[PDB]
RNA sequence: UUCAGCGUUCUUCGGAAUGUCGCGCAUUGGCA
RNA sequence: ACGAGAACAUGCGCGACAUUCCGAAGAACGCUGAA
C-alpha cells in the first residue's frame, strides 16, 4: 500500500503490520502459564473499539461511488484522530499501539490525499493490525 | 400476441436482506451484505427472488403432490404462469419478472434527512451449551426505501388471462403476508405491493379490467 | 427459578446518585422554610430575561462568586413565591446539619421521572456480600417511590467530632420501604443462604470496623443521639456516601489487622494527600464515619437498609 | 395453506435496553445505545431478539437434551414452531416474528407529557478491593413505551395448530416472567404482551377458537 | 464553526493547539506535574462536559435540522453555568476565555442549526480528549 | 468560629460469525 | 453461385435455512481546604 514511511524510513504495509505486531509481542509467564502480551498490554477489546471507529467511516466511503473523500468523511477522520488521542491518553497500551503503528499519523495523510483508495488502504492496514494481533495471540 | 405490463412499487415494511456474495468482507464489517446493482451501488430486489418466492407460495396454496421432488411437478396453473421444463412438455412462462430497482423518490427521501439506504444490524447467537454469544453484522435495506417493480404477462391463450391474473393476485397476497429474501422468520423482508399499474403495452388485448 | 419479593426498609437515608450535582445558585433554599425548590435552569433564565432581571442576576453571581444562592437574589428582587412556582420543578424538606446548603446530589429518576432504586444497585450491594452464579441471581428495578419519602440530608463526617461537610444528598427517608423482585436458581442460590451471608457480612462489618469507629468521641456523640437503632439482622448498605468498609471485601475476608493494613495501603496509594502524608495505621481505617441527622436531632447512619425476603 | 396473523402491543414494564452497534458516541454521553429504526430514529424491538428469547425460554422449559450443542437439537415442538436447519431434516418455521415498531399511540402519549422515548441510566462498576469505579451511561427505552408486534403463523398441519398455539402461549408467559434485551438480571427489560386480534389472513382456517 | 480573533478557525486541530499552548511542565519536588490552563484539572472539564452532554443528547434525539426553543433555553442556561463556573474558578475562567466556548455557544444560538451544535459539541469533546492526551 | 466542596474514574472484558449446500436437470455425449 | 443454407445455449430454479447484541458490571471512594 506504501501508506507511509516510518521513522528510519520503513514503509507502512500489511507485511509491516505483521512485523509491528511481531516486534511488540512478548511472552510473560504470569502465574506459571505463558501469556502473550502485545504492545505492552494492548487488549483485544480496545483494538476492537478502535476498529469500530474505522468501520463507521469505512461504511460511508466504501459504499460511496465518489473517489474524493466527502467533507463529512473528512470530519469523521478528524474525529478519529481526536478519539485516537483520547484513547492514548486514557490507556498507556493504546498510546504505545498508536505510536508503534503510526495509525494516528496516517489519518492525517489520508486527509491530505482526499482519496477513497488511500482511505481504503488505511482501513486495510488497520484491519491487518487487527488480524495479525489475533494471529500472534 | 399481446404483452401486458404490470408496473408498480414494493415497500419495505421491515428491513429486507437479499444476500449477495462473491466479495471478501473486511474484519469487523458486515459479514453478509445485500445484493446491490453494481452501477448504482444501490440495493436491488432480484426478479429471480420475487419469482421464486411467489411460485413457492402459490404452490403451497394450491397444494403439493405427496413427495414432489421437482418444480415441474407443480399444478398446471403454476407451470402455465411461471413456466415448465418437462421433456416434451416445455411450457413457456407467461410471467417475466424483472429486477426491482430502488426508487428515485425513496432515494430522494433518504438523501434528504441524510439516511443510509442500508442499515447494519448487530445480532448474536447464544450457544445452547456454553451460553456464549457470538456476534454478527448483517446488512438490511431500510424500511422507508421502496423498489420499483416491473412484470410482463404474455397473452398466449386469451381465455385463461383472467384466471392467471387471479393466481397472480393470490400469489401477491401470499407474498404480502409472507416475507421476501432471507431471515424473514426473525423479522426481515416484510413488503407490500402498494402500487400497481396494469397496461397492455404490446398488442390489442383489453387490460382495462385487469 | 424461585422468585422472592424483596422489601427494603431504610434505617438511614439512602442516596442513589443519578449522576447530577447542583450548585446552591441553581436551587432555592430558604432556611426558615427548611425547603429547597429545585429549579429547571433554562426556565428560570427565560423567566429572568422576560422580567428584565437577567442582567441583575448576572451581576449578583459576579458580585458574590463564592455564594450565589438563588433565594437571596430572588428575595433581593422581591420576586413572589407564586412567581417562583413557574420555574420550580418540585420542593423537598431539608435536614441541615450545620446556614446555606453548599451543593445538592440529586436522587436517580427514570425517563418518566419517578424516583426508583436501580436493580443494578441492589444486585451490586448483595454481590459484595455474597462473593465467596451472579447470572442466576436476578434483581429488578424498584417499584417507583412516592416523592413524599424523599428529603435532602446533610453529609456529616464523624471522626472525633461531627463536622457537616459541604455535601447535601436527596435521600429516601427513614421508614420508607422499597419493593424489588428477586429471582434465584435453586442450583446456585438459596434465599436462606443469601440471608445468612448478609447477616454474617454485617456481623463482620460491625465487629471489625464499626466498634472501633464508635470508640472515637465523635462516634460516641453519634451513638448518644440515637445513631445506631436497636434493631440494626439482615443489613445492606445501598446508599452512596456509605464508606469504604462497605463496597469492599477486605473486612469480610481478611483479619482485622490485616484488613486494616491492606485498606490503609490502598488509601495511601489512591489518596496521597489525606493518607499518603500519614505514616502509621490509625485506630480506624478509613478514619471517618458518614452520618445524617434530622430536625428531631436524631442521627442516622447514611445508606443503611434492612432487607426482607418473602416467597 | 392458511396464514394466521397476530397483532398486538409489547409494553415496557421496566426500562428496556436492546444493544445496537456502530453508533458513534460523544465522550461522557451515552456509550450503550439501544437499537433504533433508521428511518424514524425511534427505538425498535428486533424480531430476531423476540424469537431468540422465546425459543430459548421454551426449549429450556420443556428441557434440553444432555450435552446439547446446537439449536437444531431442540425438542421437536420447538423445531416445528421456530424451524430447523438439520441436515436431512430441515423443518419450516410456522412462527414468523417481525420487528416491533414504536407505536404511534405511545409516541403521542410521550409527546403529550414532553418525555423522551429513551431514558439514560448512569451505572458504574466498583472494584471490591480498591473501590475504584468505572462509570457507564446506558440507554433504555422509557417505561410505558409500547411496540406494535406482528406475528405470522403458518398452518402446515391442522391437527398440530392447537398444540402449537398452546406452546406459543407458554413461550409468551415465559417471556413475561423473563426479560427481553440485555442486563435483565439487573432489572432491565421487563415487558408485557397484549393481543389486539388473532385473525386468519390466508386460507379458510378458523382462528376464532384460538 | 467560527473564526476566533486574529483570524483563526475553530477546529479539532485548533482544540489540540489550544490545549498544548496552555500546557506547562512546572516540575515539583523533582517530579513532573503537568498543569493545563493555569491549573485546570480534569474534574472541572468533565463537569463542563456533562453540561454540554445533556443538551447534546437532547439535540441528537431530535430529527429536525433547527434547534427547538427548549434547546435555545438550555444553551442560555449553558451560558449562565459557564459564567458561574468561570467566576468561582480562575482556571475555568482561563480555559473558557482561551477556548472561546462562551462565544461559540452564542454562535450556535445565532446559527440555530443542529449541525452547528453537533460540531460545537465535537469541538468541546476534542478539547477534553486533548486535555486527557497531554495530561 | 465561619466559608467552601474538592479530587479521581467517563465505560470495561469476552465473544467478531458459524454450520449447511457450492449448481442440478434436458438436449448433447455414453450404452445400444 | 462462400463445407454451404436454416438454427435464441435455451428451458426450469427464492442466496436460502438455523441463530437473543448477549454475559459480568451498586454512581461512589477519600475527606478535606480556605479564612
**Interface test with chain A among B23, B29, B137, by most A beta carbons within 10 Å:** B29
Task: Please give, rounded to a whole number of angstroms, the shortest distance from the CA of C123 to a CA of chain D.
Answer: 7
Residues with Cβ within 8 Å of residue D84, at least 6 apart in sequence: D72, D74, D90, D91
Q: Which residue of B41, B118, B120 is in closest CB contact with A65? A: B41
**Contact (Cβ atoms closer than 8 angstroms) between residue A16 and residue A128:** no
Closest nt by CA–C1' to B134: F15
The grid cell for C249 is 471485601
B 76-115 residues, CB < 7 A, strand G:
82-85, 90, 92-93
In this complex, the residue with its CA at the shortest distance from the C1' of nucleotide G16 is B182
DSSP code at position C239: S
Positive or negative torsion for Cα C105, C110, C113, C115: negative
For D180-204, b where at least 16 C-beta lie within 10 A, e where not — what string?
bbbbbbbbbbbbebeeeebebebbe
Experimental technique behind these coordinates: cryo-EM
Name the helix (H) or strand (E) containing A131.
helix A116-135
Concatenated DSSP letters for B98-139?
PPEEE-HHHHHHHHTTT--SEEEEEEEEE-TTT--EEEEEEE
- Give the total residue count for chain E: 135
Residues in chain D closer than 8 A to E42 (CB atoms)? none
Residue C309: exposure state from Cβ atoms within 10 A (0-12, 13-18, ≥19)? middle
**Interface test with chain E among A80, A85, A95, by most E beta carbons within 10 Å:** A85
Beta bridge partners of D202: D3
Nearest residue to B124 via CA among B114, B135, B116, B113: B135
Residue C230, phi-psi category: left (phi > 0), alpha (psi -120 to 50), beta (remainder): alpha
Name the helix (H) or strand (E) containing B76.
helix B76-82
C-alpha D13, offset from chain centre = 13
DSSP code at position D180: -
**How many angstroms separate the CA atoms of D76 and D64, rounded?**
11
Long-range contacts at B126-135 (CB < 8 A, ≥ 24 apart) = B126/D52, B126/D56, B127/D69, B128/D59, B128/D64, B128/D68, B128/D69, B128/D70, B128/D71, B128/D73, B128/D74, B129/D67, B129/D68, B129/D69, B135/D21
Nearest residue to C235 via CA among C16, C10, C13: C10
β-pairing verdict for B2-12 and B198-202: antiparallel
Query: Which nucleotides in chain F lie closer than 7 A to a protein CB?
Result: 2-20, 24-26
**Contact (Cβ atoms closer than 8 angstroms) between residue E105 and residue E56:** no
**Contact (Cβ atoms closer than 8 angstroms) between residue C263 and residue C250:** yes
Residue linked to cell 429545585: C38
**How many angstroms separate the CA atoms of C139 and D40, rounded?**
33
Residues in chain A closer than 8 A to E11 (CB atoms)? 78
**How many angstroms separate the CA atoms of A74 and A111, rounded?**
6
Residues with Cβ within 8 Å of residue D118, at least 6 apart in sequence: C111, D34, D43, D139, D140, D141, D142, E61
- What number of helices (H) and strands (E) belong to chain C? 10, 13
Does residue D22 belong to the interface with chain A, where contact is any CB pair within 8 Å? yes
Name the helix (H) or strand (E) containing A6.
strand A5-6
**How many angstroms separate the CA atoms of A128 and E125, rounded?**
29
Residue linked to cell 478491593: D129
Positive or negative torsion for Cα E117, E121, E124, E126: negative
B169 CB less than 7 Å from any atom of strand F: no
Beta bridge partners of C6: C180, C309
Does residue D104 belong to the interface with chain E, where contact is any CB pair within 8 Å? no
* Terminal CA-CA length for chain E: 26
The number of CA neighbours under 13 Å toward the Cβ of D46 is 28
**CA-to-C1' span, E93 to F7 (A):** 19
3 state SS of D33: coil
C-alpha to C-alpha distances, C273 to A63, A82, B201, C74, C278, nearest whole angstrom: 55, 33, 88, 40, 9
Positive or negative torsion for Cα B75, B80, B84, B90: positive
Amino acid at each position: 500500500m506504501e501508506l507511509a514511511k516510518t521513522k528510519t524510513g520503513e514503509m507502512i504495509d500489511l507485511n509491516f503490520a505483521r512485523k509491528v505486531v511481531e516486534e511488540n509481542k512478548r511472552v510473560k509467564d504470569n502465574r506459571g502459564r505463558q501469556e502473550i502480551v502485545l504492545f505492552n498490554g494492548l487488549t483485544t477489546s480496545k483494538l476492537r473499539n478502535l476498529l469500530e471507529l474505522i468501520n463507521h467511516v469505512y461504511t460511508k466511503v466504501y459504499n460511496s461511488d465518489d473517489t474524493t473523500l466527502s467533507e463529512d468523511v473528512r470530519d469523521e477522520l478528524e474525529y478519529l484522530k481526536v478519539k485516537f488521542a483520547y484513547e492514548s491518553g486514557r490507556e498507556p497500551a493504546v498510546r504505545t499501539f498508536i505510536e508503534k503503528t503510526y495509525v494516528d499519523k496516517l489519518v492525517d495523510v489520508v486527509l491530505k490525499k482526499n482519496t477513497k483508495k488511500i482511505f481504503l488502504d488505511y482501513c486495510k492496514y488497520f484491519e491487518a493490525l487487527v488480524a495479525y494481533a489475533k494471529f500472534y495471540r | 400476441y399481446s404483452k401486458i405490463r404490470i408496473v408498480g412499487k414494493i415497500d419495505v415494511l421491515t428491513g429486507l436482506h437479499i444476500g449477495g456474495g462473491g466479495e471478501t468482507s473486511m474484519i469487523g464489517a458486515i459479514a453478509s451484505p445485500v445484493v446491490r446493482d453494481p452501477y448504482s451501488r444501490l440495493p436491488i430486489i432480484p426478479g429471480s427472488s420475487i419469482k421464486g418466492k411467489m411460485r413457492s407460495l402459490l404452490a403451497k396454496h394450491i397444494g403439493l403432490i405427496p413427495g414432489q421432488k421437482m418444480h415441474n411437478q407443480d399444478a398446471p396453473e403454476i407451470l402455465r404462469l411461471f413456466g415448465s421444463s418437462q421433456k416434451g412438455a416445455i411450457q413457456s412462462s407467461r410471467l417475466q419478472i424483472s429486477d426491482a430497482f430502488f426508487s428515485k423518490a425513496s432515494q430522494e427521501e433518504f438523501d434528504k434527512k441524510d439516511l443510509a439506504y442500508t442499515e447494519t444490524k448487530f445480532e448474536n447467537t447464544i450457544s445452547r451449551l456454553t451460553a456464549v454469544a457470538n456476534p454478527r453484522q448483517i446488512e438490511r435495506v431500510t424500511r422507508g426505501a421502496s423498489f420499483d417493480f416491473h412484470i410482463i404477462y404474455n397473452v398466449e391463450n386469451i381465455n385463461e388471462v383472467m384466471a392467471d391474473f387471479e393466481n397472480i393476485k393470490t400469489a401477491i397476497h401470499l407474498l404480502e403476508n409472507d416475507y421476501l429474501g432471507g431471515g424473514g422468520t426473525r423479522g426481515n423482508g416484510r413488503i407490500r405491493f402498494v402500487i400497481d399499474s396494469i397496461d397492455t403495452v404490446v398488442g390489442d388485448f383489453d387490460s382495462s379490467n385487469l | 427459578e424461585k422468585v422472592y419479593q424483596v422489601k427494603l426498609k431504610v434505617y438511614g437515608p439512602v442516596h442513589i446518585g443519578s449522576g447530577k450535582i447542583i450548585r446552591k445558585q441553581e436551587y432555592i433554599y430558604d432556611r426558615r422554610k427548611s425547603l429547597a425548590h429545585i429549579v429547571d435552569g433554562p426556565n428560570l433564565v427565560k423567566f429572568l430575561n422576560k422580567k428584565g432581571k437577567f442582567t441583575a442576576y448576572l451581576q449578583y453571581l459576579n458580585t458574590t462568586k463564592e455564594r450565589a444562592d438563588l433565594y437571596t437574589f430572588l428575595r433581593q428582587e422581591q420576586i413572589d413565591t407564586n412567581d417562583w412556582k413557574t420555574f420550580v420543578l418540585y420542593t423537598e424538606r431539608v435536614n441541615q446539619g450545620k446556614k446555606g446548603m453548599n451543593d445538592l446530589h440529586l436522587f436517580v429518576r427514570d425517563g418518566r421521572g419517578d424516583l426508583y432504586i436501580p436493580g443494578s444497585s441492589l444486585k451490586g450491594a448483595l454481590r459484595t456480600v455474597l462473593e465467596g452464579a451472579f447470572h442466576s441471581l436476578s434483581i429488578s428495578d424498584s417499584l417507583p417511590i412516592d416523592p413524599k419519602n424523599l428529603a435532602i440530608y446533610q453529609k456529616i463526617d464523624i471522626n472525633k467530632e461531627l463536622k457537616p461537610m459541604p455535601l447535601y444528598r436527596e435521600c429516601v427517608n427513614v421508614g420508607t420501604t422499597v419493593e424489588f423482585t428477586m429471582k434465584i436458581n435453586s442450583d446456585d442460590w438459596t434465599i436462606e443462604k443469601i440471608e445468612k451471608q448478609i447477616q454474617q457480612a454485617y456481623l463482620q462489618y460491625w465487629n471489625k470496623w464499626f466498634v472501633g469507629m464508635v470508640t472515637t468521641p465523635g462516634g460516641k456523640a453519634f451513638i448518644k443521639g440515637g445513631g445506631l437503632p436497636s434493631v440494626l439482622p439482615t443489613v445492606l448498605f445501598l446508599g452512596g456516601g456509605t464508606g469504604f468498609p462497605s463496597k469492599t471485601t477486605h473486612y469480610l475476608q481478611k483479619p482485622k489487622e490485616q484488613a486494616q493494613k491492606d485498606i490503609f495501603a490502598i488509601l495511601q496509594r489512591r489518596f496521597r494527600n489525606v493518607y499518603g502524608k500519614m505514616a502509621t495505621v490509625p485506630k480506624n481505617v478509613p478514619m471517618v464515619l458518614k452520618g445524617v441527622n434530622d430536625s428531631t436531632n436524631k442521627w442516622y447512619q447514611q445508606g443503611v437498609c434492612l432487607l426482607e425476603f418473602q416467597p
